[PDB]
Amino acid sequence: MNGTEGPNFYVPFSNKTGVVRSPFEAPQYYLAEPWQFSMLAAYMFLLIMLGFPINFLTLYVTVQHKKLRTPLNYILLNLAVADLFMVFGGFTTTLYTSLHGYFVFGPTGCNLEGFFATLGGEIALWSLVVLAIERYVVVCKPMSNFRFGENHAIMGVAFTWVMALACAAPPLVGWSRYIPEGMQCSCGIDYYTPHEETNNESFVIYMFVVHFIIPLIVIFFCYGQLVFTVKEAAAQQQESATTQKAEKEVTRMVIIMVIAFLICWLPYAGVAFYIFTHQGSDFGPIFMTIPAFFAKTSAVYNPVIYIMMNKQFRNCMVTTLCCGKN
Amino acid sequence: DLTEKDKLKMEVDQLKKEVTLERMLVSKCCEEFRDYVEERSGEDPLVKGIPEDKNPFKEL
Amino acid sequence: SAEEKHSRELEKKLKEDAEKDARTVKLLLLGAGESGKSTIVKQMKIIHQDTGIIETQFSFKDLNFRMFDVGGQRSERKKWIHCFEGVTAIIFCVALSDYDMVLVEDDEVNRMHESMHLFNSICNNKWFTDTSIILFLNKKDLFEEKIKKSPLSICFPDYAGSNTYEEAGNYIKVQFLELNMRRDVKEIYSHMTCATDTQNVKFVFDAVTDIIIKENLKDCGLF
Amino acid sequence: SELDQLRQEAEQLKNQIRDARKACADATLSQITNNIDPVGRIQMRTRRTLRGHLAKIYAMHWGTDSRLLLSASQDGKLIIWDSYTTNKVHAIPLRSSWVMTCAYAPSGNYVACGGLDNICSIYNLKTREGNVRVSRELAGHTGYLSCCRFLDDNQIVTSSGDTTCALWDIETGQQTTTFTGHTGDVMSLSLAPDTRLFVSGACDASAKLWDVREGMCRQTFTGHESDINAICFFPNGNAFATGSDDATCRLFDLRADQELMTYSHDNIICGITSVSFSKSGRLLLAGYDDFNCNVWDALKADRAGVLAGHDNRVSCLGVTDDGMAVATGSWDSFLKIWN
Ligand SMILES: *C/C=C(C)/C=C/C=C(C)/C=C/C1=C(C)CCCC1(C)C
Numbered sequence: 001m002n003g004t005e006g007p008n009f010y011v012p013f014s015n016k017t018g019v020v021r022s023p024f025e026a027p028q029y030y031l032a033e034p035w036q037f038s039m040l041a042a043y044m045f046l047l048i049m050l051g052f053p054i055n056f057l058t059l060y061v062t063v064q065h066k067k068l069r070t071p072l073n074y075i076l077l078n079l080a081v082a083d084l085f086m087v088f089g090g091f092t093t094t095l096y097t098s099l100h101g102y103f104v105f106g107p108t109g110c111n112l113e114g115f116f117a118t119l120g121g122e123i124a125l126w127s128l129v130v131l132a133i134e135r136y137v138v139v140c141k142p143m144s145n146f147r148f149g150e151n152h153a154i155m156g157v158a159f160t161w162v163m164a165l166a167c168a169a170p171p172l173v174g175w176s177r178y179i180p181e182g183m184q185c186s187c188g189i190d191y192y193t194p195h196e197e198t199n200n201e202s203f204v205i206y207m208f209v210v211h212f213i214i215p216l217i218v219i220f221f222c223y224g225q226l227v228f229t230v231k232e233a234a235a236q237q238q239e240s241a242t243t244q245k246a247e248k249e250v251t252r253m254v255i256i257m258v259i260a261f262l263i264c265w266l267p268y269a270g271v272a273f274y275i276f277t278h279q280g281s282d283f284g285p286i287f288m289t290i291p292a293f294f295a296k297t298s299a300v301y302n303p304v305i306y307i308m309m310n311k312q313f314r315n316c317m318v319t320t321l322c323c324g325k326n
Numbered sequence: 327d328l329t330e331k332d333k334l335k336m337e338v339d340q341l342k343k344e345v346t347l348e349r350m351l352v353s354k355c356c357e358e359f360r361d362y363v364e365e366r367s368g369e370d371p372l373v374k375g376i377p378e379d380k381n382p383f384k385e386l
Numbered sequence: 387s388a389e390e391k392h393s394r395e396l397e398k399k400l401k402e403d404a405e406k407d408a409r410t411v412k413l414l415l416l417g418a419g420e421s422g423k424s425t426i427v428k429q430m431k432i433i434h435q436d437t438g439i440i441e442t443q444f445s446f447k448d449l450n451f452r453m454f455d456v457g458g459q460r461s462e463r464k465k466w467i468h469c470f471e472g473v474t475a476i477i478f479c480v481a482l483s484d485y486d487m488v489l490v491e492d493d494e495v496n497r498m499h500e501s502m503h504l505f506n507s508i509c510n511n512k513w514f515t516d517t518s519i520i521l522f523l524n525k526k527d528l529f530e531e532k533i534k535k536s537p538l539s540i541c542f543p544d545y546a547g548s549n550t551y552e553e554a555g556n557y558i559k560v561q562f563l564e565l566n567m568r569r570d571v572k573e574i575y576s577h578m579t580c581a582t583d584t585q586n587v588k589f590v591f592d593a594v595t596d597i598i599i600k601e602n603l604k605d606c607g608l609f
Numbered sequence: 610s611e612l613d614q615l616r617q618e619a620e621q622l623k624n625q626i627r628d629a630r631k632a633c634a635d636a637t638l639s640q641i642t643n644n645i646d647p648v649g650r651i652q653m654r655t656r657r658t659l660r661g662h663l664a665k666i667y668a669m670h671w672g673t674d675s676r677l678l679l680s681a682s683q684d685g686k687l688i689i690w691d692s693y694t695t696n697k698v699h700a701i702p703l704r705s706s707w708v709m710t711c712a713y714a715p716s717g718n719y720v721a722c723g724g725l726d727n728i729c730s731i732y733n734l735k736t737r738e739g740n741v742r743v744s745r746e747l748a749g750h751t752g753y754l755s756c757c758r759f760l761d762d763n764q765i766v767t768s769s770g771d772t773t774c775a776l777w778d779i780e781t782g783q784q785t786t787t788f789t790g791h792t793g794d795v796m797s798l799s800l801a802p803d804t805r806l807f808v809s810g811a812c813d814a815s816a817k818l819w820d821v822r823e824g825m826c827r828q829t830f831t832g833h834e835s836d837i838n839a840i841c842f843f844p845n846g847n848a849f850a851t852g853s854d855d856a857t858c859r860l861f862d863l864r865a866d867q868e869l870m871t872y873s874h875d876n877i878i879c880g881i882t883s884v885s886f887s888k889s890g891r892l893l894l895a896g897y898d899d900f901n902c903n904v905w906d907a908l909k910a911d912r913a914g915v916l917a918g919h920d921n922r923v924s925c926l927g928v929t930d931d932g933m934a935v936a937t938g939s940w941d942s943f944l945k946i947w948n
Pocket residue numbers: 090117118120121122186188189191204207208211212265268269270272292295296
């Protein structure tokens with residue numbers, strides 16, 4: 001049988017022996033041993049201490065001079081600023097509840113943490129999509145005499161903001177419910193529970209049809225046209241060695257980018273399709289936090305593949321990190 | 327004909343014109359430059375400041 | 387507020403003309419002597435459709451060009467060439483029949499050492515270092531007159547060691563591309579042509595589309 | 610065959626006039642003026658920042674209204690605006706596409722430009738609505754122009770790439786007179802405050818003066834180890850300042866043939882682009898290649914003020930005659946108005 005439910009919470013264990021009390025009050029050590037809890041706390045503290053200075057430093061580097069803020073690095077600055085929501089709201093709270101007791105905030109606190117911890121992930125995802133579509137439009141030249149400007153980039157940043165907000169807020173009232181699920185540390189979304197009063201089936205089918213299949217198809221389309229265009233361009237000018245360096249550079253970076261996006265937002269879609277494909281399935285409580293781990297690691301290795309390994313940022317930000325050497 | 331054996335004749339005619347010009351009194355001309363600049367430098371609008379009144383560059 | 391509304395209308399007109407101006411590829415031509423300027427300017431403008439600086443303008447295959455000339459206002463070189471930085475493709479010109487040019491205005495100056503002394507004064511000049519060079523070389527039918535002896539060791543030391551066209555023309559192109567610094571990332575896209583040829587504008591279009599795909603990726607930071 | 614003897618005759622009389630200007634041979638003015646006090650620190654902040662251009666800009670010139678600035682962008686726009694409401698008053702296209710100089714009118718009526726193509730184009734701005742008609746076009750050269758200055762509403766004076774200088778009248782369309790006899794190429798000039806003279810600087814540091822009615826040369830001033838780029842004088846007509854490409858701003862007097870003051874400094878390493886005195890003349894204004902319009906005093910050779918307006922190199926500047934303001938021109942379209 002699936003897990004047991006209270007008024008406004010779900011838990012992935014059975015009520016066979018009658019031991020699981022409310023997940024807001026008196027402590028729990030009967031769904032997981034305490035060394036698991038403290039190891040989770042240590043992992044999130046490590047993630048805080050590494051993930052704050054990368055975003056703080058790229059904000060300082062883009063506020064120092066304006067040789068760098070261009071009509072195109074707006075989207076990537078938005079990716080730099082969305083991640084500090086996930087490191088500032090959605091991580092210290094998990095550290096707090098993992099350390100002392102468990103989740104002593106309250107249901108309004110969960111309904112706040114869920115919003116501030118899904119907004120960052122959603123802005124990250126749609127900003128990766130917008131970045132891919134900007135790159136394909138400005139390099140492969142699909143349109144008859146369309147150059148690039150400033151109004152279009154501010155349009156794109158407003159686009160990713162309105163999509164992430166209007167499709168991560170209707171969970172707050174109506175269409176879904178915020179639940180603390182897993183090891184009762186962070187509130188996620190209610191994709192697991194079968195609660196039929198809150199129309200939950202519509203939310204899972206809507207999220208899978210808008211937030212994972214069309215972003216994946218548009219990333220594949222854009223980067224495929226990009227690698228085909230650069231390959232066919234360097235096919236012509238044979239003996240020019242610099243574009244023979246360029247071909248290998250772009251066909252390594254596209255592969256590493258697509259694999260980074262897929263292993264940062266696959267396992268959520270994995271457990272959702274597995275839950276929907278077998279109505280009625282039992283799971284361990286440690287099993288439904290590995291998608292949270294595989295998602296929140298994109299608070300560190302998502303900027304390091306778009307900022308540091310990117311050109312034009314690194315050689316300036318290192319020499320205004322300590323201004324000593326490379 | 328073009329410039330070569332003509333520019334030198336023009337230059338030595340210029341230099342023969344130049345030798346007849348008298349000049350001295352470098353200390354006197356430096357004093358005169360001194361008292362000309364210090365005669366008016368007190369009422370200069372750039373050396374002292376702006377009392378927010380007539381300079382037509384208020385911050386608006 | 388009539389003055390302010392007038393300035394707003396003028397500002398809209400100015401920015402409209404600026405975004406109209408931005409979609410062109412400003413090329414810069416140069417080259418000393420009688421080095422095929424007449425042929426390369428005839429073979430550019432009107433053949434496809436069947437004392438200051440001379441601005442000839444042409445367009446072909448959905449990309450509108452514009453090129454200038456520096457051939458009529460000779461002066462001190464190092465003072466106005468900075469006003470051309472930021473153009474994309476510095477078209478050079480050199481004449482392949484330069485072996486027989488005994489003089490131009492002096493008593494003894496070969497034309498080959500002159501154009502080499504001009505070409506070194508650009509690739510190291512610190513105003514032109516991130517702009518590629520589309521070299522040319524023409525009058526090849528007169529260079530096909532090397533069947534009669536006219537040995538290549540007159541304007542060189544004994545290097546080519548051959549007489550036919552297939553080995554000599556390979557030696558001159560290496561002699562230019564070795565004088566290149568290769569300081570930063572730029573590369574020189576040579577060619578070969580004559581007078582009665584055609585469709586070499588296809589070559590300069592296929593070249594200039596490779597300082598756009600190769601260049602835009604630097605701005606995105608991908609390459 | 611014989612002109613080597615002419616050179617040998619010239620050399621000893623050149624040394625003769627060298628010791629003739631070493632007859633007085635007093636030092637610079639800082640050696641005598643120990644009594645005076647320094648000007649003290651002086652600081653300016655940006656009051657208004659202009660906007661509207663896209664390209665680099667080269668030159669500007671204050672009007673005699675002390676209210677109107679003109680400027681010349683690289684694409685072909687010649688802009689003429691106010692400095693009170695910060696809004697554009699006219700916008701002129703060019704039949705050419707380059708600029709290297711500009712000039713306003715002492716009558717405050719109409720302007721003149723002309724760049725690499727060897728043309729001085731005078732544009733009327735009096736009776737036409739909007740885009741104004743090209744009033745006159747004046748050829749007569751085979752080299753690039755360098756600077757134009759109005760001396761009345763009638764005659765202009767120009768200095769071109771053909772190692773000449775020429776005084777023209779504009780309703781006849783020809784040269785009234787020439788000013789030849791100059792080895793290197795000229796670079797700038799400025800009109801003496803009583804419309805009689807203009808000092809002229811060139812490649813080989815040979816700053817020479819001229820007079821208009823006689824139409825011949827007057828004197829020589831050679832005091833620099835390299836090329837110069839801009840010259841102007843003191844407003845009461847006694848002395849003129851000069852700046853070179855190796856940070857050697859110097860100052861001469863019109864009747865002394867002597868380096869009256871050097872303003873060199875040990876730190877600065879890159880050249881200048883423009884120099885203009887202020888109204889009082891207590892301080893010399895200048896702009897260098899290291900992005901700075903650092904302003905010297907004019908009496909005791911000290912870096913009085915340092916102001917870094919913008920990131921690229923300054924191109925040209927120049928004060929207003931009533932001295933209330935200072936304009937400067939960037940290389941990236943921002944026209945700062947310091948106070
Ligand atoms: C702290 C938690 C984070 C950042 C997790 C956020 C997860 C989502 C916004 C999930 C989205 C989807 C689901 C509802 C399940 C299937 C996969 C998605 C992406 C469609």
